[PDB]
Design a protein around this ligand. Structure first.
Ligand SMILES: Cc1c[nH]c(=O)[nH]c1=O
Ligand SMILES: Cc1c[nH]c(=O)[nH]c1=O
Lengths: 233, 233
């Protein structure tokens, strides 16, 4: 049975990865983003969708979860989805400026505003990716994300969350928060994951050294062959 | 029919990727390395091998092909191979120091010398990955790579080459050079690829924007589902 990580633990593992093992931030994010794009394509394959190419809104927050979202948007386009991104708060750091340019030149469009009504999102986007807040959230949630989350909580189309459903307390969840259909837990699941009631839970981020998985007793499942995702439960 | 690129063309496409599209070097290398690890696992799956875990020597050169090799070693270990690396000439740049530490802490060992006789390599390593020179080679080939290539040309176990078989002229090949069993062409094949006579030719590096594939008329095949490799011919 895979370990579900405290916020303490998750912070520690993440910090080993960057300092002790010296993975660069972009390397880990590229693998995370790919895992996400991959989970989405397995859960919601293109052939199984009414639109062709199937359309997807990726909503990216102001830190690393946002960046996973950018990577994810990009691999989705390659897997034959048609993504659109909303990215309202963009850290001005080469990592993020690069990701934005990549998507831009992939003709992945960045909206200037969130569609203000649940219905409009529903009509335009067959699936929505919540790439807003991640495991290091505390929060608490400022604008424009409060009003964004609030639009999301009224959607009828599925939500895919990266790592944590944004708006949820990282260990305790949130009974009134958003309720996604797919959760991609990166590295290993966080304790908020026990409150998850969607259909698809996937593990992603196939880059965890054995020595580290042992040290924290993560008990990761065996990813099949060369896959970067594993369907849990 | 996929385009086979001149060295001119390949240099140009590569430079669009980094300048115009602003992919960072590590992002592209992580995807390349993964493609390689993946081609190897599909061509030589673990179950199909006499040793368990199956063993692999990754020989890494002094530039980017070397770095793809480091990434590749690492994903191989994750896919259940047991790799060993020989990396004699290491650029002292954070990118490469990071890759070395990652592998080190994965318990992937870096040999201090090349086993000097073809037979010793054969007895220890079921497969050898040629991660030495890449598409920007001119060369010409200095030590210790000359004596290395020379050891390789006497092997009985298969060779997997990344992008180009090292020692070959990038467009014209090399009749007396090494003769690999697997070639992983990254991005798109180079003209040396027409001289390839091994069994496995895979395309890798699933990150080519449509606008760029169109501008250079690469005519890439369709990668299946969420795969990062495609078997050619
Ligand atoms: C440990 C860790 C690293 N990176 C993530 O995105 N999530 C995690 O839980
Ligand atoms: C265009 C190009 C980029 N990167 C590579 O490794 N090989 C290539 O041919």
């Amino acid at each position: 049975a895979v370990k579900y990580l405290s916020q303490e633990e998750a912070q520690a593992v993440d910090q080993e990865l960057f300092n002790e093992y010296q993975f660069s931030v972009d390397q880990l994010m590229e693998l995370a983003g790919l895992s996400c794009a991959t989970a989405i394509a397995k859960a919601y394959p293109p052939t199984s969708m009414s639109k062709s190419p199937p359309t997807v809104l990726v909503i990216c927050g102001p830190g690393n979860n946002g960046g996973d979202g950018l990577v994810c948007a990009r691999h989705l386009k390659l897997f034959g989805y048609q993504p659109t991104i909303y990215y309202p708060k963009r850290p001005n750091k080469p990592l993020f400026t690069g990701l934005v340019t990549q998507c831009q030149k992939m003709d992945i469009p960045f909206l200037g505003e969130m569609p203000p009504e649940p219905m409009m999102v529903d009509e335009l986007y067959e699936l929505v990716v919540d790439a807003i807040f991640g495991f290091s959230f505390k929060g608490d949630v400022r604008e424009p994300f409060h009003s964004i989350l609030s639009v999301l909580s009224g959607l009828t189309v599925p939500i895919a969350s990266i790592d944590i459903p944004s708006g949820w307390d990282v260990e305790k969840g949130n009974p009134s928060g958003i309720q996604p259909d797919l959760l991609i837990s990166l590295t290993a699941p966080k304790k908020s994951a026990t409150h998850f009631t969607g259909r698809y839970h996937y593990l992603g981020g196939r880059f965890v050294p054995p020595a580290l998985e042992k040290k924290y007793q993560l008990n990761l499942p065996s990813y099949p062959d060369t896959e970067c995702v594993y369907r849990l439960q």
